[PDB]
Design an enzyme around this catalytic site. Structure first.
Site, PDB file in Angstrom:
ATOM      1  N   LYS A  94      42.437 -43.998  41.011  1.00 63.42           N
ATOM      2  CA  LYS A  94      41.398 -42.980  41.119  1.00 63.42           C
ATOM      3  C   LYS A  94      41.465 -42.046  39.921  1.00 63.42           C
ATOM      4  CE  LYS A  94      40.737 -42.891  46.115  1.00 63.42           C
ATOM      5  NZ  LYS A  94      40.844 -42.078  47.357  1.00 63.42           N
TER       6      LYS A  94
ATOM      7  N   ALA B 189      47.884 -45.618  42.815  1.00 63.65           N
ATOM      8  CA  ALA B 189      48.402 -45.743  44.172  1.00 63.65           C
ATOM      9  C   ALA B 189      48.911 -47.162  44.384  1.00 63.65           C
ATOM     10  CB  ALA B 189      47.329 -45.393  45.202  1.00 63.65           C
TER      11      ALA B 189
ATOM     12  N   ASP C 223      37.955 -35.561  55.919  1.00 68.11           N
ATOM     13  CA  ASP C 223      37.279 -36.853  55.864  1.00 68.11           C
ATOM     14  C   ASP C 223      38.203 -37.946  56.394  1.00 68.11           C
ATOM     15  OD1 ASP C 223      35.349 -38.758  55.436  1.00 68.11           O
ATOM     16  OD2 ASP C 223      35.593 -38.834  53.255  1.00 68.11           O
TER      17      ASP C 223
END
Lengths: 390, 385
Positions: free
Chosen positions: A95, A199, A268
């Site tokens: 990301k 990640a 979320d």
């Protein structure tokens, strides 16, 4: 030489919890491998890597400096997220930096319009490790030369197409997703390094099926329409009598996650994943934390509602939360101690670590007010019989 | 089992909004449990074991009474069962090897029961859940059709053919004559039991005209057939610029193109919910008539409007991967009907070939209006991929 706040914490008996003995099940895998593979076989029923385990520390180093050999784009993704696969055949999820360090999410943003930021993915791994959950797959931050390490090593026509040179002579790219993948939202290095979170990748779904659960406090991802738990104060009397939530180790594991999410402000958390081979009786993989650490001057009480309605926690995590409030321990210094071991220092701005302290004692007040209404023992389950004393 | 893999993928774990007291239309019989399960967004659930058990009722429940649906294109019978629930019966008009002739207009085409069945499974695989349930069934046309009707106009049409077979033709318009009779070998006919939606007394249905409705005449072309910018204006006319309606027509028009059903002149809604519900994909019998021809006329709504739901786009891409893909997923669930094979193998392969044309129509359309302008996003808050 300096004293480690983090050293004192991991000596404390509340962090010397031992697991049950592992049978032929409770292991996910039958059985000098790469570090990403030694992480996979270390996954068991209760945790995702276990305490200490020098593989995780060295697997985070692999994400930092292993040569990126191939990059592909998760097509049809939530927002732009890249897949890095390395020289040692292990891969990772990438990301990129979408917001600066000083920025906050605007107040008028809905939870579903929020940016996903690498700071939360990284910081959530450390926060979860400091709470002794050990449920987040390891993630290390990394500076990536976006020419030689992103564009020039992908055969994905849709990710390659978006690279351009801006009037500022910087290298930009944005991919092709749905949220914030346009020319006006491109990601531009200064001039050719972008920074992001690598990640570590959970084992391939071929060899580890993952059940995906709805969580019962999932928001109504609509404006002008409230959810069931938003109107019914006795919502959880009904959820503790619904299948998977009356048998665990499950409502209590959701209380762990829902305290995790409140500390970061991540609203979320519409789903959570499990490892299937273990059944209705395993841990929750704390994935997709990219929405946390967006606001630091604001505490989102909506996330805590599962705790005020269900009114029960685990004793292990309750006393640790109380320990994480004592000045000799406490989230703030215990977090920048670890978070200084990333290349992206500072991964969390100082007000965000300060917000961890304030949100933490709100959790202790919701438990104190809730333990003072249902009584102890009814609120605090006991998972410490046969564990180090205090 | 390839169908097992599909329903595990997260794109089929979409959850509904919370259902209010509205959004609902309303040891029972299964057809009644199907009615009360109808809500604003869908018509059933991804099991919901009621639906699977409702098809077993259509297969083997004792037929108690048979009536003749008046004034249809062809013959359709009303079977009402032991438990007072009824269904629509379309008998076998075409064999499995036949194709509709090329010189046929869409308005001269027959309805075949195999298409009615296959359309239900195809729709369930696209996670639409808009077609009323339908099961195939062999009916002893003596004991289950002729001898259990009190409509003398239907009973009168039974005769014995020169071949000592049992025949009948009913009384409709244009294909209900002695020369169009349906003859068993010697007294079994086979057909599709399409489950009946709730009675219009207690569940009103608004029926809408769709704007790509063909001009059901030769020589005369329709409005959308001449103006390639037809949908620039159709997205500004009342009901189509508020939904979830243009998006629902793209769902329906991709559905119809896959089957080759070019007879979608009207569509129904449940009214009790308003302009903001799903489209019931009814009477799909004109599909699966041709397998060596893909009728592009059906897709024009997609090239002109150029927008789909993200929900249905990602599934369309998934149903193209070799590990899933329409063909094997379709003959699997079409293997669970009594009328096997309900779809011949060339028809299932055309389901794959037509799919890759739809995926090509969207990519050419997504690189000319861009994402977000083409693909609406309704997967906020749904399981990741």
């Amino acid at each position: 030489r300096v004293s480690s706040v983090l050293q004192s914490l991991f000596e404390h008996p509340l962090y010397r919890t031992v697991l049950p003995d592992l049978t032929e099940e409770d292991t996910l895998f039958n059985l000098s491998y790469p570090n990403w593979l030694r992480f996979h076989i270390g996954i068991n029923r209760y945790e995702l890597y276990s305490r200490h385990n020098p593989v995780i520390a060295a697997l985070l180093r692999d994400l930092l400096s292993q040569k990126i050999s191939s990059v592909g784009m998760k097509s049809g993704g939530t927002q732009l997220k890249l897949i890095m696969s390395f020289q040692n055949y292990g891969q990772a999820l990438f990301k990129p930096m979408k917001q600066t360090r000083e920025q906050e999410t605007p107040p008028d943003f809905f939870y579903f319009s929020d940016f996903e930021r690498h700071n939360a993915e990284i910081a959530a791994f450390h926060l979860d490790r400091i709470l002794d959950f050990r449920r987040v797959p390891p993630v290390a931050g990394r500076l990536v030369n976006m020419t030689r390490e992103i564009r020039d090593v992908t055969r994905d026509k849709k990710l390659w197409r978006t690279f351009f040179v801006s009037p500022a002579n910087n290298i930009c790219f944005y991919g092709e997703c749905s949220y914030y993948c346009s020319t006006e939202h491109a990601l531009c290095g200064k001039p050719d390094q972008i920074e992001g979170s690598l990640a570590a990748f959970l084992p391939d779904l071929a060899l580890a099926k993952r059940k995906t659960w709805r969580n019962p406090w999932r928001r109504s991802y609509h404006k002008r329409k409230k959810a069931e738990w938003e109107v019914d104060p006795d919502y959880c009397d009904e959820v503790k009598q619904t299948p998977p939530y009356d048998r665990g180790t499950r409502l209590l594991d959701i209380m762990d996650m829902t305290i995790f999410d409140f500390l970061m402000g991540n609203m979320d958390r519409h789903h959570y994943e499990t490892f299937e081979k273990f059944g209705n009786d395993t841990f929750i993989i704390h994935l997709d934390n990219g929405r946390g650490f967006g606001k630091h001057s604001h505490d989102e009480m909506s996330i805590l509602v599962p705790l005020t309605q269900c009114c029960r926690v685990k004793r292990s995590t309750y006393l640790r939360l109380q320990l994480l409030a004592k000045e000799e321990y406490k989230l703030s210094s215990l977090m920048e101690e670890s978070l200084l071991q990333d290349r992206l220092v500072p991964v969390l701005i100082k007000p965000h670590l300060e917000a961890l302290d304030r949100r933490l004692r709100l959790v202790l007040k919701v438990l104190s007010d809730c333990v003072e209404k249902d009584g102890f023992s009814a609120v605090v389950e006991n998972d410490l019989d046969g564990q180090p004393s205090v």
